[PDB]
């Protein structure tokens, strides 16, 4: 299988750099340009450049030149964009991505994104707290998971380690005293809950975290 | 720099009929025209690439049209699923330059929210702070007025409300709004409200809990 | 002076139920503590003294312990006649110092309020005043938000407002509101409207007179 | 809280001709409302008062209508020098409240900028820092761009640009354009040049200046 | 003349309180409703509340019950709005207001407004540089730049105000927790370099006045 991976998420002092990387795997990884987007938060997309991974041959966006150097390691099949004299307006997503016509169709493969955040403050792991609904009864029951005061974006929400998707909200993450809270609801029927373990599983990669919070009645 | 100029911010349709996007550059660019979609925290995918050819796992229901300045994207039989922000690219010059991006807007009939509200629990009054959340899922339109009471004495400081987009299945909204106080501020009160104000009923929705 | 410090400026529970209230005292005063009621209104009573012995009149309900430096006064079958403030004291140093005091508070269902508007007397018309009164009686909780309109305008000036404290026959809330105008402005205007806010509903309580 | 709602966030017209706002209430207000206009960096200024009434100084052609809950401002032979935000207000109810105001635009022809531009001074050398300004004055439509390019090549990094409102005199637009950069840094090119992409030309308005 | 004074701008560090001032003259003090209303940056207004200085009898926005506090000096004539537990939403725009009614017509007014600014960084001057045109038009524009002031807000003038046609003021940008803005104005080339132009900066929060002649 086709795969980009990235890191999920990179704190950076401003001033500083950054290299994300671009693992690759699955296809021969210097028969393709490697391109990459950066996208700000609530913002369209951009085109930073290109780097074929045969020679290290690059097209740059004028814009990012001084900015991001792209590199490549043929030896773990890895690209890297390097982005230096971090600012305020550096903190976005730098995707990966590739396109591939193989003589029948044409697929473009994506990598998962990097959330880049560039700012001072240190990294603080989310706290869970389950939403159970009070003592004080109908065929269906609201739960939900309370994310709070986190640092940087993102997190990633599931139920059930996936197994429950229909009826669930998770909510954009807003943005207080420095620090992020989102939260998250899922609604299953009455005879699951609470007969039923009903999970709310937390990830927050910059700080490493992985919190299984379970609703207990 | 090439200019890519999608008019409009939003595009609006019933579910399973049909939405066009344009596009419009800013020189000649022949057919050298992308399209991609993407979804609310996804990663972007291509769906159209030399203006009228789809990558492979598109649908037919998305057609690209258009050559040199002008160029169109169409969606047939759209459904929820279909929600998401569009953009148009050009790669004939150098550097690559993306549409603005347009996001699909799906009409259907009113909807009232379903309104939960949970008290602040037991954990996280440990930590000398408490929060009361406030659900109000699948209403349309996405308008909606969420209000505390802490003993019938409205309280706005403290409150974060957040709210998603428009539903993948139901074409829906939903909004989460949070009353964080203090652990002690807390405990001076009683009863803790959340009242819903939205154009489906004229009485407001009154969600509440005591101590 | 020794400091007699009340944990706590109100104690809730139930008709039926117990409550107890606690002093802290900054030096050692042995077992010479009192304890007192005072209902609104009135002189203060002595309940205890010696920290323990209760004063004739005083029923068991009210039981007292303590020595040195924590003491406690506890009211056992609690009922709406009890509601008052009650203060400790020490009487083993000079000068002698009392508590903050602690009002006792009773936990009861909702009640909605009576609510009865009253236009100017003739007898007040006759000195150039126009005082309209609302009475809102026996609620719960005592939270409640009224507000006066004249012919639609509302009117926050010009208002007085009183809260009883806690009913000492059913542990409800009372509130009187009256607004006052001059004769003219008075007579300048038709609809005289009091409208209130509680709890127990989503809709006012609207309580109105035209003086047409 | 009543709500006010003014519909439009922008409202448009050409110089000489008329502009109505409208504004919503949630609750009949009768015609205790009230209108504001408040130019940029300025004080806010009352209009109309009891939903029709002008306040002393304020000319005819500001007129007010409306009762109970639709009202509307219309503003007639209007001049460049009514550009501001236009701002409903309720006060027969408590809390006041305001809407959420209409900012006036005028449509007129488009108009190229006056390009300048402006090397350091050397009062800012002393500094260690170098900023360039560009001024783009009087063009129309806002929408605008600017690029520099140091020595021929774009330079988008440390550049401050700022938008003026439309201007009370003439309806048009400015922009200033900084680019900022260290004094080593400027010394250490040559060519300094200002591009203005606007409507108005296919080509964009270059000025340019050597260091030497 | 009827006249409310407010200072310009307020510094006040996060948690602590600061006191507004609107100081009444040319009127009877205690015979007017004496208003005061919020505008946060780029914001719309909000009613803070009402106070008669008569009695000191209030009305207020119950939003603002337990952060703002209203009061009156009537020996000196004077209104007070405290701010107490700043936040950052608590940086705005106050201003104080009155209506008068005299039987005939009906006049408001307002004070300048206070520019409050809730922030830990401390005060930092403006540097003033003028802008004058390369070497070697019937009409000539001239500029100043006004870079790496805080807080908020400074005024530029032209020739002390004799110069207002032809003047282009820029909103002010922040960058690194310091303001810029410029300022441009357009003369005929018979005025400069004949004639002095001079660009006035005044920023009250570090008690600042810059004259910057533009020198050829
Ligand atoms: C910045 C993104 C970007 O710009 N890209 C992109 C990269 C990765 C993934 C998706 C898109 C472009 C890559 C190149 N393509 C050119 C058109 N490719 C073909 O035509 C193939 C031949 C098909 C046929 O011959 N049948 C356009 C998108
Ligand atoms: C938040 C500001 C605000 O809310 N205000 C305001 C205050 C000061 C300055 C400007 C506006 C309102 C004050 C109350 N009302 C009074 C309207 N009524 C009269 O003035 C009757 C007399 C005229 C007549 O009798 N002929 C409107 C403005």
């Known amino acids: 299988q086709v795969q980009l991976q990235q890191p999920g998420a990179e704190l950076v002092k401003p001033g500083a750099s950054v290299k994300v990387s671009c693992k690759a795997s699955?296809?021969?990884?210097?028969?393709?340009?490697m391109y990459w987007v950066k996208q700000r938060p609530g913002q369209g997309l951009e085109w930073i450049g290109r780097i074929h991974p045969s020679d290290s041959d690059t097209n740059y966006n004028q814009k990012f030149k001084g900015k991001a150097t792209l590199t490549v390691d043929k030896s773990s099949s890895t690209a890297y964009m390097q982005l230096s004299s971090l600012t305020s307006e550096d903190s976005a997503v730098y995707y990966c991505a590739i396109e591939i016509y193989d003589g029948y169709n044409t697929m473009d493969y994506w990598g998962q994104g990097t959330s880049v955040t560039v700012s001072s403050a240190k990294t603080t792991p989310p706290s869970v707290y389950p939403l159970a609904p009070g003592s004080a009864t109908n065929s269906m029951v609201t739960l939900g998971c309370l994310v709070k005061g986190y640092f940087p974006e993102p997190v990633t929400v599931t139920w059930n380690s996936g197994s429950l998707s229909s009826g669930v909200h998770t909510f954009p993450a807003v943005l207080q005293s420095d620090l992020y809270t989102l939260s998250s609801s899922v609604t299953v029927p009455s005879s699951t809950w609470p007969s039923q373990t009903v999970t709310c599983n937390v990830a927050h990669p910059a700080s490493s975290t992985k919190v299984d919070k379970k609703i207990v009645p | 720099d090439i200019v890519m100029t999608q008019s409009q911010k939003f595009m609006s349709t019933s579910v399973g009929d049909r939405v066009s996007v344009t596009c419009k550059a800013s020189?000649?660019?022949?057919?050298?025209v992308a399209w991609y979609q993407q979804k609310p925290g996804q990663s972007p995918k291509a769906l159209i690439y030399?203006?009228?050819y789809r990558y492979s796992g598109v649908p037919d229901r998305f057609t690209g049209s258009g050559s040199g300045t002008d160029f169109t994207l169409t969606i047939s039989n759209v459904q929820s699923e279909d929600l998401a922000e569009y953009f148009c690219q050009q790669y004939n010059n150098y550097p690559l330059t993306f549409g603005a991006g347009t996001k699909l807007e799906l009409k259907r009939a009113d909807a009232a929210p379903t309104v939960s509200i949970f008290p602040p629990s037991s954990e996280q009054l440990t930590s000398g702070g408490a929060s009361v959340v406030c659900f109000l899922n699948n209403f349309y339109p996405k308008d909606i007025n969420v209000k505390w009471k802490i003993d019938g004495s409205e309280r706005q400081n403290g409150v974060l409300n957040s709210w998603t987009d428009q539903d993948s299945k139901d074409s829906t909204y939903s909004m989460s709004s949070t009353l964080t106080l203090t652990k002690d501020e807390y405990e001076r009160h009683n009863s803790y409200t959340c009242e819903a104000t939205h154009k489906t009923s004229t009485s407001p929705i009154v969600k509440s809990f005591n101590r | 002076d020794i400091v007699m410090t009340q944990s706590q400026k109100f104690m809730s529970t139930s008709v039926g139920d117990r409550v107890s209230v606690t002093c802290?005292?900054?030096?050692?005063?042995?077992?010479?503590?009192?304890?007192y009621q005072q209902k609104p209104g009135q002189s203060p009573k002595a309940?205890?003294?010696?920290?323990?012995?209760?004063?004739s009149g005083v029923p068991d309900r009210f039981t007292g312990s303590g020595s040195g430096t924590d003491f406690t006064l506890t009211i056992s079958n609690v009922q709406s006649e009890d509601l008052a403030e009650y203060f400790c004291q020490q009487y083993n140093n000079y000068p002698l110092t009392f508590g903050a005091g602690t009002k006792l508070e009773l936990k009861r269902a909702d009640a909605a309020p009576t609510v009865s508007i009253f236009p100017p007397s003739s007898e007040q018309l006759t000195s150039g005043g126009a005082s309209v009164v609302c009475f809102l009686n026996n609620f719960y909780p005592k939270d409640i938000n009224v507000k006066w309109k004249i012919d639609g305008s509302e009117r926050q000036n010009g208002v007085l407002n009183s809260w009883t404290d806690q009913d000492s026959k059913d542990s409800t809330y009372s509130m009187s509101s009256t607004l006052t105008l001059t004769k003219d402005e008075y007579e300048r205007h038709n609809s005289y409207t009091c409208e209130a806010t509680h709890k127990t509903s989503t809709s006012p309580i609207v309580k109105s007179f035209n003086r047409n | 809280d009543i709500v006010m709602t003014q519909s439009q966030k922008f409202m448009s017209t050409s110089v000489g001709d008329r502009v109505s706002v409208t504004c919503?209430?949630?609750?009949?207000?009768?015609?205790?409302?009230?209108?504001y206009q408040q130019k940029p960096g300025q004080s806010p200024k009352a209009?109309?008062?009891?939903?029709?009434?002008?306040?002393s100084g304020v000319p005819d052609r500001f007129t007010g209508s409306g009762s109970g809950t639709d009202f509307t401002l219309t503003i007639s032979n209007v001049q460049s020098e009514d550009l501001a935000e236009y701002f409903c207000q309720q006060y027969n109810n408590y809390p006041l409240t305001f809407g959420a105001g209409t900012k006036l635009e005028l449509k007129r022809a488009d108009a190229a900028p006056t390009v300048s531009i402006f090397p350091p001074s050397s009062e800012q050398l002393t500094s260690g820092g170098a900023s360039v300004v560009c001024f783009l004055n009087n063009f129309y439509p806002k929408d605008i761009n600017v690029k520099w390019k140091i020595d021929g090549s774009e330079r988008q990094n440390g550049v401050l640009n700022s938008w003026t409102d439309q201007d009370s005199k003439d309806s048009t637009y400015s922009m200033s354009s900084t680019l900022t950069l260290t004094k080593d840094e400027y010394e250490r090119h040559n060519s300094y040049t200002c591009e203005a992409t606007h409507k108005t030309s296919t080509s964009p308005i270059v000025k340019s200046f050597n260091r030497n | 003349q009827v006249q409310l004074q407010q200072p310009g701008a307020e510094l006040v560090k996060p948690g602590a309180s600061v006191k507004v001032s609107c100081?009444?003259?040319?009127?009877?003090?205690?015979?007017?409703?004496?208003?005061?209303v919020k505008q946060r940056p780029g914001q719309g207004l909000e009613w803070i509340g009402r106070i008669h200085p008569s009695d000191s009898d209030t009305n207020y926005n119950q939003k603002f019950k337990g952060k703002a506090t209203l009061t009156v000096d009537k020996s000196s004539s004077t209104a007070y709005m405290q701010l107490s537990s700043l936040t950052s939403e608590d940086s705005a725009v106050y201003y104080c207001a009155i209506e008068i009614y005299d039987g005939y017509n009906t006049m408001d007014y307002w004070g300048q407004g206070t520019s409050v600014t809730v922030s830990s960084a401390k005060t930092t001057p403006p540097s003033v540089y003028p802008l004058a045109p390369g070497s070697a038009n019937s009409m000539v524009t001239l500029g100043c730049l006004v870079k790496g002031y805080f807080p908020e807000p400074v005024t530029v003038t032209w020739n002390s105000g004799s110069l207002s046609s032809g003047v282009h003021t820029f909103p002010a940008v922040l960058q690194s927790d310091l303001y810029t803005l410029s300022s441009s104005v357009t003369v005929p080339s018979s005025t400069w370099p004949s004639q002095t132009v001079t660009c006035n900066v005044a920023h009250p929060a570090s008690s600042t006045k810059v004259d910057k002649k533009i020198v050829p």
């Open positions: 699955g296809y021969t990884f210097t028969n393709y340009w």
């Open positions: 020189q000649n660019v022949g057919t050298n």
């Open positions: 030399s203006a009228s």
